């Protein structure tokens, strides 16, 4: 059996750490919801 328990509010925090770059990728989505690179 699965169960859920609260983890917090959905709120924007002003002084959050900024990381992660911003790639633009060509992808394909199959019927099973799986993403794949196209090039």
């Amino acid at each position: 059996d699965m169960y859920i328990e609260r983890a917090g509010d959905i709120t924007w925090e002003k002084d959050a750490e900024v990381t992660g770059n911003s790639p633009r990728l060509d992808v394909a989505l199959d019927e099973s919801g799986d993403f794949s690179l196209v090039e």
Binding site: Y3, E5, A7, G8, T11, S22, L25, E31, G33
Partner: protein, 153 residues
């Protein structure tokens, strides 16, 4: 608990208590990704949450009602991934999303790599609205994980 906010999706069927994903509670509907629950029912205290809508290709599922999340990435502003890793506290991570270019349009993507317990973590805009869920994406040539910003309709 029907209190809006983000939740952990736990299971007591594996070893001990394992966190399989994350979900969002909004307008009395629990939103998560299909591959997390696979449509299974969820216990929230004494109450039970029954699946209401799901789509394997979208990798999304809603409980107690139809999909309620409508906000979308504006394509310009930074967003915040409220990552809820298993056993650790919820942390907001700001980033500028990439783009998934598909034949059916472009979808935002965040280049943040987090443990398997994190699928379903919400992605928020500057006004605190959930614009998608984290946990379904690709690994690129360098090995970094890039998740699509998966939003329903």
């Amino acid at each position: 608990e029907t209190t809006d906010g983000v939740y952990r999706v736990m299971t007591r069927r594996l070893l001990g208590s394992t966190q399989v994903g994350v979900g969002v509670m909004q307008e009395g509907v629990f939103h998560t990704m299909w591959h997390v629950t696979k449509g299974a029912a969820l216990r929230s205290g004494e109450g039970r949450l029954d699946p209401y809508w799901g789509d394997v290709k979208q990798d999304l599922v809603s409980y107690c009602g139809p999909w309620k999340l409508d906000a979308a990435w504006d394509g310009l502003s930074e967003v915040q991934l409220l990552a809820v890793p298993p056993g650790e506290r919820a942390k907001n991570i700001q980033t500028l999303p990439g783009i998934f270019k598909t034949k059916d349009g472009d979808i935002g993507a965040v280049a943040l790599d987090y443990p398997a317990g994190t699928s379903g973590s919400p992605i928020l805009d500057k006004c605190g609205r959930v614009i998608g869920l984290y946990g379904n994406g690709v690994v690129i040539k360098n090995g970094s994980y890039v998740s699509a910003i998966t939003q329903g309709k």
